[PDB]
């Protein structure tokens, strides 16, 4: 009955305050752990399903706020593998509610082509009802090639499972001769998670007031600004999001410094580890550690170029296996 986004324009104060923060560093990607749907239903004295139903309305409301603020990529936590342990009523109800919107998204296609909405559902989707997986794939398949903005729905997802699958993909590449165990790198692992196409979130917003990540983007939100707001998700307001963007701008200087240093340190550490591997090979086989042959320097340039070859080739097969989803 309701599509995935709303057309509401910003208000005077909302547009004025927006123009103000937009002068500073804005987040390119915000992540949301939509928590509090059930607690909100109790205070409102409404059925649990209606709480979750309102939660979706808010997700569409919040997405438009993001687009109005220029935040073009949004990742959300919609269903956890853990949530499979709730009552059948609630779990079936959440599946039903998913089937309704994913079907309406296809009915409201072309409107998705209108705004370049790339819907990407991320998770261990093989645990979902077969019907729901086909709807998901159908949606994901049509909204692919769209690039005006990006929404990542995390249905039946846990970060540990995403990390472990990404490890499996790397061991698979070793099993097929596409990878050697030495090639497994933090960067390589990054290109194996479900979020391989999405940059690491700038902000991580959890509502309800819980101060835990509940197994969500643990790898990705390492240097993300963690915003924990007491508001129950179905009551989220533009100003709640505003405050979150504020907390990001406050720390952005030090956050970005720490990010660059981690990256610069990581590169130095590998270059030292690589030079040692080249040194261990050159110390053996007789040879000379340096000299003018620049033998270590030439051997290093090859090891890197051959490193990418196996890795870049492996990534092509992973994506081909990924794009092998004629399940639509």
């Amino acid at each position: 009955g309701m599509s995935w986004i709303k057309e509401g324009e910003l208000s005077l104060w909302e547009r004025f305050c927006a123009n103000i923060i937009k002068a500073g560093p804005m987040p390119k990607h915000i992540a949301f752990i939509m928590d509090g749907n059930r607690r909100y239903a109790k205070k409102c004295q409404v059925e649990r399903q209606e709480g979750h139903s309102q939660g979706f309305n808010k997700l569409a409301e919040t997405l438009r706020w993001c687009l109005n603020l220029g935040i073009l990529e949004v990742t959300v936590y919609a269903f956890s593998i853990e949530n499979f342990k709730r009552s059948k009523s609630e779990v079936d109800g959440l599946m039903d509610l998913a089937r309704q919107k994913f079907s309406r998204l296809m009915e409201e296609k072309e409107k998705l082509q209108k705004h370049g909405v790339c819907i990407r559902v991320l998770g261990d989707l093989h645990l979902l009802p077969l019907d729901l997986q086909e709807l998901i794939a159908q949606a994901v398949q049509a909204t692919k090639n769209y690039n005006k903005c990006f929404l990542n729905v995390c249905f039946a997802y846990t970060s540990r499972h995403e990390i472990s699958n990404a490890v499996r993909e790397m061991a698979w590449g070793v099993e097929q001769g596409l990878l050697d165990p030495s090639d497994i790198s933090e960067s390589l692992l990054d290109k194996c998670l479900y979020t391989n196409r999405s940059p690491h979130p700038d902000i991580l917003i959890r509502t309800s007031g819980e101060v835990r990540l509940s197994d969500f983007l643990l790898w990705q939100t390492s240097h993300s600004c963690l915003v924990f707001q007491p508001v129950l998700w179905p009551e989220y307001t533009f100003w709640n999001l505003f405050e979150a963007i504020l907390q990001f701008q406050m720390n952005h200087s030090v956050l970005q410094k720490a990010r660059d240093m981690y990256a610069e340190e990581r590169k130095r550490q590998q270059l030292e580890r690589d030079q040692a591997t080249v040194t261990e090979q050159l110390l053996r086989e007789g040879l000379q550690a340096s000299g003018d042959a620049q033998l270590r320097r030439t051997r290093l340039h090859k090891l890197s170029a051959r490193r990418e070859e196996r890795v870049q080739g492996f990534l092509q097969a992973l994506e081909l296996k990924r794009a092998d989803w004629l399940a639509r």
Partner: protein, 192 residues
């Protein structure tokens, strides 16, 4: 004496963290080893079994002995392998880099035909993720103005409660213990 009072304080809390995480995001100046050590012994007295110290620059990992010495100082004044076990000083590579290590090991056992990729279960990786003799942290105290974990054991903080204090410099027991009350009242529904 005062040892029993601190043990009673921890016993009265509805819950105590078995593994404590002290994350210092402050980088304006060098950390205060005394204030750090003072927190550590507090954890030991209230009854925290494991305490992990973390900073993004690795200053603690560099000056490990300076901390362990400071710990033993407070540990005796107004309070060996006894603390080297529970106290573990960490750095960024204890997280993502260690997860990479574990992949490199399993990718190798897979390549050795000894293990199959289909056997890289979540629980399997966890065991392979340097479980050692430490459980996953359940309470992290984030000291600083930065609102980030700065890469503290990302695999293990999956359900950790993250409490923030404005600075660790000149920290006070009431400040540290008020954090423990907060965790004690925190509700974990485990997705149910």
């Amino acid at each position: 004496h005062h040892r029993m009072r601190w043990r009673a304080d921890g016993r009265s809390l509805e819950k105590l963290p078995v593994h404590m995480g002290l994350v210092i995001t402050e980088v304006e100046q060098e950390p205060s080893f005394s204030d750090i050590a003072s927190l550590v012994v507090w954890c030991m007295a209230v009854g925290i079994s494991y305490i992990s110290v973390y900073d993004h620059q690795g200053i603690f990992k560099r000056n490990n002995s300076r901390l362990m010495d400071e710990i033993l100082k407070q540990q005796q004044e107004l309070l060996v392998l006894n603390c080297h076990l529970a106290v573990k000083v960490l750095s960024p590579e204890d997280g993502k880099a260690d997860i990479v290590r574990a992949a490199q090991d399993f990718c190798q056992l897979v390549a050795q035909k000894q293990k199959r990729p289909t056997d890289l279960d979540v629980d399997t990786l966890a065991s392979l993720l340097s479980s050692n003799g430490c459980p996953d942290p359940d309470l992290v105290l984030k000291f600083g103005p930065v609102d980030t974990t700065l890469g503290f054991l990302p695999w293990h903080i999956r359900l950790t409660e993250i409490v923030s204090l404005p600075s660790h410099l000149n920290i006070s027991y009431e400040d540290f213990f008020s954090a423990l009350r907060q965790y004690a009242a925190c509700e974990q529904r485990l997705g149910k």
